[PDB]
């Protein structure tokens, strides 16, 4: 619903979604070639399936293609400084792809707006919605459009005849963070097949050991997981599968 939906937010009005209590799968996106650019900072996307994060933030927007370079840590641009600013120590990355077939119109798709003028460069990860008229003269414009009273918001001319730099590009930025809180977001790990009646090195749910695992005839309780003997001897029963 975030990677490919019917409505994506604007660059200046980007949409934030919180991903938590999710079992994410980063292998499918790594293998998918439908995305134009996907390269990430701090953590290699190959090993994203291993690291577990407490919460993830996905911000979706549609920008100009030539502007996809501006969306990076320590980058200076127009939409970078006035619409979406990234922190220098940003953890995560963006996934961007050309979307001229959906986000452009024959007469020009004018539903996408971006801010050109504002008081000063905004802090990273800040949302601006106010459409106050940017005044450049000494006299107060009184919020009335006219001379020397510029409108900061302007619409992109998305047309199929434009170049690849001017084609609309759908970008979803994934940001990962951790703090003194339990982590919940990570992959499904892996479960190799089980073999019986053979001396094996087992790892059940984070408990490791060596021994032979035979079929057993004993009754547990639904919530019970491990097994024990008269002195701290593990007899694991509950298969995680």
């Amino acid at each position, epitope marked *: 619903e975030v990677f490919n939906a019917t409505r994506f937010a604007s660059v200046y009005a980007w949409n934030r979604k919180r991903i938590s209590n999710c079992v994410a799968d980063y292998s499918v996106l790594y293998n998918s070639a439908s995305f134009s650019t996907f390269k990430c900072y701090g953590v290699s996307p190959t090993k994203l399936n291993d690291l577990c994060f407490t919460n993830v933030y996905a911000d979706s927007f549609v920008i100009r293609g*030539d502007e996809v370079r501006q969306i990076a840590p320590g980058q200076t641009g127009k939409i970078a400084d006035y619409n979406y600013k990234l922190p220098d120590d940003f953890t995560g990355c963006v996934i961007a792809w050309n979307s001229n077939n959906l986000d452009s119109k024959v007469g020009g798709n004018y539903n996408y707006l971006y801010r050109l003028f504002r008081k000063s460069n905004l802090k990273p990860f800040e949302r601006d919605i106010s459409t106050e008229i940017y005044q450049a003269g000494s006299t107060p414009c009184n919020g009335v459009e006219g001379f020397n009273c510029y409108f900061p918001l302007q619409s992109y*001319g998305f047309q199929p005849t434009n170049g690849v730099g*001017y084609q609309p590009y759908r970008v979803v930025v994934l940001s990962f963070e951790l703090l003194h809180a339990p982590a919940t977001v990570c992959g499904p790990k892996k479960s190799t097949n089980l073999v019986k009646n053979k001396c094996v090195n087992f790892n059940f749910n984070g408990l490791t050991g060596t021994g032979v695992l035979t079929e057993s005839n004993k009754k547990f309780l639904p919530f019970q997981q491990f097994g024990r003997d008269i002195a701290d001897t593990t007899d694991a029963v509950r298969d995680p599968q």
Partner: antibody, heavy 117, light 110 residues
Framework: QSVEESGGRLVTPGTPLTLTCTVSGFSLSRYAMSWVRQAPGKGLEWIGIIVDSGHTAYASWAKGRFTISRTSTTVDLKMTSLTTEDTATYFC??????????????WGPGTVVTVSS | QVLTQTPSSVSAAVGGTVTINCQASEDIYDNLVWYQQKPGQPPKLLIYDASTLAFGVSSRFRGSGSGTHFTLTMRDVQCDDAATYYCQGEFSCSSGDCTAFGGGTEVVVK
């Protein structure tokens, strides 16, 4: 990839004339053909472009009196209400690859359209 | 909407260098190309994206610039470089007239 064109003739003002560009060695449905012209000894002028999908773009100075059409192997351009200042040389130019519009790496030999009595 | 090329004409010796400036009335990012038109020959694209040398062209031609100012410099100009050069850049869309061509410059080597 060879791009050629023809249609040069001497015509009176106000007489419509069509010029046909023939491609060879590539697929037209993937690549954008465009029309440019230059006056004798003067600078280059842009006429229009047709994308591979089929959408059309023109120039403001043209005022909207050109018409560029596409088919199997003939990118044709037609004119109406010729004036005496349209005596120039016309070319059809190809692109580099998918997308990357307005590059014009391959050009036609060149044909001259003259308007006089 | 307006592309400007300076100077209109300039000459230099064989063992010399010259520069050409192309200015755009609007921000065009780096989407700018150059051409060389010999007398009677169709133009050949020399540099595209204002910093990438085209296939089959020499390394004595270099391009730089970004935004609204671009510069093409030729080093050790030979007698074969005597031709006309033009700059072209994409100009947004609906706002302006798609693309436009520059006025061009003439180079002659003594």
């Amino acid at each position: 990839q060879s791009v050629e064109e023809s249609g040069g003739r001497l015509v009176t003002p106000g007489t419509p004339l069509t010029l046909t560009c023939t491609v060879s060695g590539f697929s037209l449905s993937r690549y954008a053909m465009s029309w440019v012209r230059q006056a004798p000894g003067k600078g280059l002028e842009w006429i229009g472009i047709i994308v591979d999908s089929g959408h059309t773009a023109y120039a403001s100075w043209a005022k909207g009196r050109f018409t560029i059409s596409r088919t199997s192997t003939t990118v044709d351009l037609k004119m109406t209400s010729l004036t005496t200042e349209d005596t120039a040389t016309y070319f059809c130019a190809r692109e580099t690859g998918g997308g990357a519009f307005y590059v014009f790496e391959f050009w036609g030999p060149g044909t001259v359209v003259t308007v006089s009595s | 909407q307006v592309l400007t090329q300076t100077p209109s004409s300039v000459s230099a010796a064989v063992g010399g260098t010259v520069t050409i400036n192309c200015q755009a009335s609007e921000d065009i990012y780096d989407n700018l190309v150059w051409y060389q038109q010999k007398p009677g020959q169709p133009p050949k694209l020399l540099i595209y994206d204002a910093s990438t040398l085209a296939f089959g062209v020499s390394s004595r031609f270099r391009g730089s610039g970004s935004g609204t100012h671009f510069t093409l410099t030729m080093r050790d100009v030979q007698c074969d470089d005597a031709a006309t050069y033009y700059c072209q850049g994409e100009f947004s869309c609906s706002s302006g007239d798609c693309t436009a061509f520059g006025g061009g410059t003439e180079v002659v080597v003594k």
